[PDB]
Amino acid sequence: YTLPAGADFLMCYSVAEGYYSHRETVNGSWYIQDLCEMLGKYGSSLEFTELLTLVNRKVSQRRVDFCKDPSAIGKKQVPCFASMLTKKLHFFPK
Amino acid sequence: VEIX
Amino acid sequence: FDPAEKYKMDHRRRGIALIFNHERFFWHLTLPERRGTCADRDNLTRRFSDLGFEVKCFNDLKAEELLLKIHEVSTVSHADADCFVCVFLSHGEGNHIYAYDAKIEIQTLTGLFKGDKCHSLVGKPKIFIIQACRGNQHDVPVIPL
Numbered sequence: 001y002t003l004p005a006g007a008d009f010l011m012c013y014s015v016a017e018g019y020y021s022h023r024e025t026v027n028g029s030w031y032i033q034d035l036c037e038m039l040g041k042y043g044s045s046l047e048f049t050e051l052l053t054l055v056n057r058k059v060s061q062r063r064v065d066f067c068k069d070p071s072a073i074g075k076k077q078v079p080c081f082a083s084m085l086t087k088k089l090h091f092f093p094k
Numbered sequence: 095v096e097i098x
Numbered sequence: 099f100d101p102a103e104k105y106k107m108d109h110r111r112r113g114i115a116l117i118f119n120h121e122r123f124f125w126h127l128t129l130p131e132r133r134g135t136c137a138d139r140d141n142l143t144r145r146f147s148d149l150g151f152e153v154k155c156f157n158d159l160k161a162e163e164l165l166l167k168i169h170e171v172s173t174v175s176h177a178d179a180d181c182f183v184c185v186f187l188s189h190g191e192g193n194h195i196y197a198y199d200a201k202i203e204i205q206t207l208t209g210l211f212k213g214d215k216c217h218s219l220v221g222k223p224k225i226f227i228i229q230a231c232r233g234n235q236h237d238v239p240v241i242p243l
Contacts, residue, residue, distance in 0.1 A: 003213060003220060003221060004213070005212045005213035005214045005215075006212060006213070007213065008219075008220075008221065008222060008223055008224055009208065009211075009224045009225075009226070010223060010224070010225045010226070011204075011208075011226050011228070012225065012226065012227045012228065013228050013232065014098075014228060014229045014230065015231070015232055015237075016232070016237075017232055017233065018232055018233035018234075018235045019231070019232055019233055019235045019236070019237050020097045020098065020231050020232075020233070020234070020235065020236050020237075021097075021098040021229065021230060021231050021232065022095055022096070022097065022098070023095070023096050023097075023098050023132060023133075023134050023135070023138075023229075024095055024096075024134050025095075025096060025133040025134045026133075026134060026137065027134065027137060028134045028135070028137035028138035028141060029098070029134065029135075029138050029187070029229045031229055032138040032141060032142060032187070032229050033138075033141070035142075035145075035227070036141040036142060036144075036145045039145040039146075039148075039149065040145055040148075043145065043148070043149050044148075044149065048225075063239060064095050065095070066095070067095060072236060074238075074239050075236045075237060075238065075239070076237040076238060076239050077237055078237065085105075085223060087103045087104055087105045088102065088103065088104040088105070089104070089105050089107075089181075089223055090104060090105075090107060091107065091112070091149045091150070092107065093150075094107075094108075094112060094150050096130070096132070096133065096134075097231060097236075098132065098188075098189055098190070098229065098230050098231040
């Protein structure tokens with residue numbers, strides 16, 4: 001079979017459409033911190049979209065704990081990934 | 095925490 | 099039809115992981131500094147290096163420079179690579195991210211890697227990772243019933 005020219009893209013966003021995304025001034029962004037933790041732990045074994053789903057859960061557990069603007073306290077973030085992948089993706093040790 |  | 103089919107990840111190289119790291123912006127964009135972003139860049143470099151990627155970082159590129167660099171990478175051969183990864187760490191809104199001096203629409207960046215534009219990545223994963231705001235809504239907390 002031929003393939004569509006649009007196929008096999010995976011777009012991994014730190015937050016769903018239309019929203020603010022959060023970044024800690026020392027530790028880095030919520031999303032990249034949790035992505036990197038999951039990569040360290042599971043990158044070499046789990047399927048990558050499976051891993052990204054774990055990242056969705058990790059980031060969803062976080063909240064703005066302190067903020068100069070009291071209305072922003074407790075605010076949230078869910079990441080969003082878009083798959084045009086056609087197969088399972090693993091990064092087993094080469 | 096800062097906004098991106 | 100194999101429901102367990104996997105991408106072939108047995109090429110000579112894992113492939114390239116580009117990281118575009120943006121910390122400060124042209125004064126007139128009125129965008130605050132992104133403290134903590136180099137922490138992200140370094141964290142990603144370690145994790146992706148450990149997965150076999152050849153990681154290349156670029157810091158605070160102007161839009162013209164960024165687009166040149168991404169065009170360059172899209173035109174080199176990925177024949178002996180498993181996949182391609184491209185990370186943007188910056189400000190954003192709508193469907194765009196910011197380079198140092200100007201917004202870039204995400205579709206402009208991804209379009210360079212579509213099958214007809216980048217033959218050597220046809221059939222291989224093309225993975226884009228974007229840390230950036232995407233609008234002005236601040237999501238609120240809810241609880242289940």
